[PDB]
Amino acid sequence: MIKLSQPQIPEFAIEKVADILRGGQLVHGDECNLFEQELAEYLGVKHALVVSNGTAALHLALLALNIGPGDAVIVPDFTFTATANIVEMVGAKAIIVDVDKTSYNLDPQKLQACINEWQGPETLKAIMPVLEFGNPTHLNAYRDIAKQHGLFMIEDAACALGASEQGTMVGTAAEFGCFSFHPRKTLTTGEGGAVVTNDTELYNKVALLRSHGMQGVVFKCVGLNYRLTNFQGAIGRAILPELNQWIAKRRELANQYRELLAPLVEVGKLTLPSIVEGHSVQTYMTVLADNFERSDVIEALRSKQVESNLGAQSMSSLGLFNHKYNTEQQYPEGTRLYTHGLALPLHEGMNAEDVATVVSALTEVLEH
């Protein structure tokens, strides 16, 4: 099976994990602390904190900004459901805005309109743009719009470690950046994530919330347990020095897809993602024409040893985010991407031959 992802954890990392299990510290220790330093340097950001997963990162960012009951956060329609769920979990309302059909990211003009029209009843406090599939497109615009309207910005950069727009590393534009180390997301720790910020007060607050309010040890506030193990930290920091080369490889494979898929684009059978400068290419998602039954395409591809899937969900389609605004607005772009999107294998373990294999299979399936 040509799989969507297959992260290869360096052998030296596996040996370090074994050493830690045998005779080392299991809870967050030197490996996590070094990983945080190294992430901060990689991103050019003042502070990083590693946490249990990327959902935990978003959760902590919301809590640290005192976003909760009575409040609202704008989210894109097209994303993994965690983005909207976590807003609701803190007691805030997820306010959905449609995405761009090209970038698959929150549409800046529709974002502006939403903010312009907002008059409650909840207090609108933040935007949570998603840099979907590693696409940094609109990062700087989101920052500008947030500043223009007095909003916080939490980047849901789950899929975007190593992406960048116009000199800005994704995750670093505003109050918080949130990353995932899930196995589909290029750098993995099995489960893991990170919160980054340039604001030391926000850093200190997340560090308290991550571990029971602990600062001898004093308990300064109520908190949670979102600590990452020391051995998970060891895995992550072993992979980080490889990430740029993995992204470069992914960009080369994306160009191969672009070249080889052109015949299908020309006859209107699918559209391609736009793998802009700075895209980290965590996912390569095409969009099938409406006349294809996507579930049947996925099944046929599986039978030809190609793993494929939808790329993400449409929040407005799920029936979970029922703020009035979301009932009033329409989300054709996110709905199209949710219904017709098709992610194809793209990861650093593949070569050009593997890309051609995938395109051959997809061409065959769409012919029949």
Q: The tokens of 2 are what?
A: 């040509």
Is 179 within 8 Å of 54 (Cβ atoms)?
A: yes
Q: How far is CA 265 from CA 143, 145, 273, 274, 314, in A?
A: 34, 34, 11, 13, 24
Binding site partner of 265, from its own copies, Cl ion, none, Cβ cut-off 5-8 A by kind: none
Residue type at 137 in one-letter notation: T
Q: Residue 182 interacts with its own copies (CB under 8 A)?
A: yes
| One residue of 21, 26, 289, 318 binding Cl ion per CB under 5 A | 26
Stretch of 34-42, 87-95, 129-137, 171-179 contacting its own copies, by CB under 8 A: 87-95
The minimum distance between CB 94 and its own copies, in angstroms, equals: 9
Binding site partner of 17, from its own copies, Cl ion, none, Cβ cut-off 5-8 A by kind: its own copies
Q: Residue 24 interacts with Cl ion (CB under 5 A)?
A: no
Binding site partner of 7, from Cl ion, its own copies, none, Cβ cut-off 5-8 A by kind: its own copies
Q: Residue 318 interacts with its own copies (CB under 8 A)?
A: yes
Q: Residue 12 interacts with its own copies (CB under 8 A)?
A: no
Q: What is the dihedral of CA 268, 271, 274, 279, to 10 degrees?
A: -150
For the chain, state the CA radius of gyration.
Answer: 21
For its own copies, the closer of residues 184 and 279 by Cβ is 184
Is 127 within 8 Å of 92 (Cβ atoms)?
A: no
Q: Residue 21 interacts with Cl ion (CB under 5 A)?
A: no
For Cl ion, the closer of residues 30 and 277 by Cβ is 30
Strands in 123-127's sheet, in edge-to-edge order, are 47-51, 193-197, 176-180, 152-156, 123-127, 71-76, 93-97
Q: Residue 191 interacts with its own copies (CB under 8 A)?
A: yes
Phi, psi for 305 (deg, rounded to 5)? 65, 35
How many Å apart are CA 88 and CA 194, to the nearest integer? 21
Inter-helix orientation angle 82-89/54-64, to 10°: 40
Q: Which of residues 205-244 bind its own copies (CB under 8 A)?
A: 212-213, 216, 219, 221-232, 235
DSSP strand E in 106-228: where?
123-127, 152-156, 164-165, 168-169, 176-180, 193-197
Binding site partner of 56, from Cl ion, its own copies, none, Cβ cut-off 5-8 A by kind: its own copies
Q: Residue 14 interacts with its own copies (CB under 8 A)?
A: yes
The minimum distance between CB 80 and its own copies, in angstroms, equals: 8
Q: What is the dihedral of CA 123, 126, 127, 128, to 10 degrees?
A: -120
| One residue of 198, 271, 313, 329 binding its own copies per CB under 8 A | 313
For its own copies, the closer of residues 52 and 256 by Cβ is 52
Binding site partner of 248, from Cl ion, its own copies, none, Cβ cut-off 5-8 A by kind: none
Q: Which of residues 169-228 bind Cl ion (CB under 5 A)?
A: 183
**Measured on CA atoms in the order 131, 141, 206, 24, is the torsion positive or negative?**
positive
Binding site partner of 81, from Cl ion, its own copies, none, Cβ cut-off 5-8 A by kind: its own copies
Is 167 within 8 Å of 196 (Cβ atoms)?
A: no
The minimum distance between CB 211 and its own copies, in angstroms, equals: 10
Inter-helix orientation angle 200-210/54-64, to 10°: 120
Please tell me whether residue 37 adopts helix, strand or coil conformation.
helix
How many Å apart are CA 241 and CA 165, to the nearest integer? 21
Q: Residue 183 interacts with its own copies (CB under 8 A)?
A: yes
The minimum distance between CB 332 and its own copies, in angstroms, equals: 20
Q: Residue 349 interacts with Cl ion (CB under 5 A)?
A: no
The minimum distance between CB 69 and Cl ion, in angstroms, equals: 35
Chain residues in the site for its own copies (CB under 8 A): 7, 9, 11, 13-14, 17-18, 21-22, 26-27, 52-56, 59, 69, 80-82, 84-86, 88-89, 91, 182-183, 188, 190-191, 212-213, 216, 219, 221-232, 235, 295, 313, 318, 320
Chain residues in the site for Cl ion (CB under 5 A): 25-27, 183
